[PDB]
Design a protein around this ligand. Structure first.
Ligand SMILES: Cc1cc2nc3c(=O)[nH]c(=O)nc-3n(C[C@@H](O)[C@H](O)[C@@H](O)COP(=O)(O)OP(=O)(O)OC[C@H]3O[C@@H](n4cnc5c(N)ncnc54)[C@H](O)[C@@H]3O)c2cc1C
Ligand SMILES: Cc1cc2nc3c(=O)[nH]c(=O)nc-3n(C[C@@H](O)[C@H](O)[C@@H](O)COP(=O)(O)OP(=O)(O)OC[C@H]3O[C@@H](n4cnc5c(N)ncnc54)[C@H](O)[C@@H]3O)c2cc1C
Ligand SMILES: Nc1ccccc1C(=O)O
Ligand SMILES: Nc1ccccc1C(=O)O
Lengths: 340, 340
């Protein structure tokens, strides 16, 4: 079987791994190749704050809730083991701050020990009068991608640096099944007017004393268009922009001041922090995650394509649920071919 | 008035500043000198793990409960301000794990968001079936000491490296009021059978990925004779020895092994951690905190002596409530001798 994954971000590699584990023993040659024009440090995943937290609003597709759940559990199960940190995994507690009372998120029972903030805790955040506290996990994009790559590589997965112009060429290449995990750039392979970029900029700072994550929410400006501080494995992410439709790939000084200025007010001690880097990435926004099979004929070429992209700003959070769903779909592909 | 404070640890310096802040505006010449033979990096306070957490056991002297409270509130008020991290302060959340069910601590309502761990949270710690989770504060001893010193220095307080062989010499030295904050060595200046050292050894390792504190409790071996992981500002403290009656100042190999092994079992990721330093210190173990006024005549001298020592393993945790008490006792002196 020749499977070609197009994409080397969290979604692409998780899907590749999940498949190899799942069918390597039943399928004779399970040729798995990864095609991508951007690898590790250059993918959107590397710009991710690295926190597990779905949107505060219910998913359009309920199945996405299950996928989020499955991902937390999968990751939680790696906590009590060495190498957990090596794969970019670590527990972290934090605050979700609001200027007004809001309803509980559907994911309240998924995270560890969720509760509302007491007035004495809210005294530490004088600009907010409502909030939640909870424990969750940090899944550092880059570290995780390096890990996956290590696991994929030793699994016999070959990686190829190349921009696919069309599924057709991959199909002509001999790919029996193509897993499309191209993120925000999916519309290029196939027009998808529902897929649009959610430009986000972040500042990575060196402020080790910061132990808890702090996410402020502005219901007026929309999700993530508010300052947040997310401590990672060894640097803190300062952020605050979510601009849908914007394709500007360059760091905007406009945003730099909003983020920095917004974060230092939240955390005055940030004044002593040292800036390590400024990044911009496009969250693959879509009303629903596109995860489905699609047949392509080409006359005696009938290639199978399984899509899995458009995970907006919850790609690290839902990654395993989607990967498992793709493996399940890949299973049907084999059953159609009587491959078991 | 000439006040001589003996001791440069958290207790000494805290008392010095509190007295100075309070009376420097009303006392005519307020001469405050701090005598000490061991300064900052070499005091027990620098070896301290840096967590604010009283004993799980009820307080002997009911008043210590209140001092612990006063201190937490004093520290908490620095949270929302810059320099909080410069004085060694930073919020931290963590677990207190038990092998058996235990009543809540008297301080359950002093810390932020106290609650018991859930079975699913306990699945992260297979060796224990009970525990609490709560948010407390980190007060890096060394940093706090440097901070206090700077404040005291710009306040006009003078520091002298000297070993006070007795109170008398100091009294004869022209000391109207002597604040005795000699910690575990107070027995030398005045025999105290109730004061015994609770030697403790710790290992400071570099493991930035650890954001939460984990403290294990084994009732059979007594307080702090069980593995604990306390993340500091920019290093983690591993520990677990509370040896009363032990006067050994050098690092024990067996103790190194008790800490390292036990901590790696609790937290497996500790394997990638680079050991930064190994230290031993003596908690001033005493059934009660000695904090009282004592009159030493010496024939015509009649020097006031206020003791403030025997804070066991909660010196950082109680420091402020005590300094405020000393400052109160000091006020009385002023009124008696009619200086105010
Ligand atoms: C500021 C910011 C913060 C965020 N923080 C979080 C967070 O803390 N939590 C969370 O869950 N989510 C977060 N995200 C969301 C985000 O990380 C996404 O969900 C993203 O990681 C989804 O992964 P992906 O594999 O779909 O995309 P990507 O990482 O972008 O990978 C896409 C891959 O496809 C390849 N590719 C594309 N087109 C082609 C082509 N034509 N030919 C060959 N190769 C191609 C690319 O090279 C790349 O390898 C954040 C995003 C941003 C930008
Ligand atoms: C491993 C360990 C972990 C601990 N962790 C915590 C923790 O996380 N939380 C917490 O609340 N506390 C902790 N402690 C408790 C501990 O730090 C004490 O409570 C301590 O700081 C009390 O402070 P002190 O000022 O009395 O003594 P010290 O800080 O030791 O200072 C005593 C001072 O007296 C001086 N002195 C003594 N005799 C003379 C003399 N005759 N002449 C001149 N000067 C003299 C000494 O030189 C020194 O300057 C821990 C202790 C240890 C060892
Ligand atoms: N997905 C996230 C989770 C937490 C904080 C920020 C983000 C973000 O989209 O930038
Ligand atoms: N007082 C403490 C608080 C937390 C961890 C250790 C200690 C200790 O005394 O060693």
């Amino acid at each position: 079987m020749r499977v070609v994954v197009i994409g080397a971000g969290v979604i692409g590699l998780s899907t590749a791994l999940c498949i190899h584990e799942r069918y390597h023993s039943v399928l004779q040659p399970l040729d798995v190749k990864v095609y991508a024009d951007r690898f590790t440090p250059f993918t959107t995943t590397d710009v991710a704050a690295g926190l597990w937290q779905p949107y505060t609003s219910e998913p359009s597709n309920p199945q996405e809730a299950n996928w989020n759940q499955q991902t937390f559990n999968y990751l939680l199960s790696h906590i009590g083991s060495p190498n957990a940190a090596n794969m970019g995994l670590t527990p972290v507690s934090g605050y979700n701050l609001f200027r007004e009372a809001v309803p509980d998120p559907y994911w309240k029972d998924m995270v560890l020990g969720f509760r509302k903030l007491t007035p004495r805790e809210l005294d530490m955040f004088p600009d907010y009068r409502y909030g939640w506290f909870n424990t969750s996990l940090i899944l550092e994009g880059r570290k995780y991608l390096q890990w996956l790559t290590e696991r994929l590589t030793e699994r016999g997965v070959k990686f190829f640096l190349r921009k696919v112009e069309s599924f057709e060429e991959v199909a002509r290449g001999g790919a029996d099944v193509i897993i499309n995990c191209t993120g925000v750039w999916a519309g290029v392979l196939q027009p998808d007017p529902l897929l649009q970029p959610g430009r986000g900029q972040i500042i990575k700072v060196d402020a080790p004393w910061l132990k808890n994550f702090i996410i402020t929410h502005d219901l007026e400006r929309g999700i993530y268009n508010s300052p947040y501080i997310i401590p990672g494995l060894q640097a803190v992410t300062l952020g605050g922009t979510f601009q849908v439709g914007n394709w500007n790939e360059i760091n905007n000084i406009q945003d730099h001041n909003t983020i920095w200025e917004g974060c230092c007010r939240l955390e005055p001690t940030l004044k002593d922090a040292k800036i390590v880097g400024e990044y911009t990435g496009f969250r693959p926004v879509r009303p629903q995650v596109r995860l489905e099979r699609e047949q392509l004929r080409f006359g005696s070429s009938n290639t199978e394509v399984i899509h899995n992209y458009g995970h907006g700003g919850y790609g690290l959070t839902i990654h395993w649920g989607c990967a498992l769903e793709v493996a399940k779909l890949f299973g049907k592909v084999l059953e159609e071919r009587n491959l078991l």
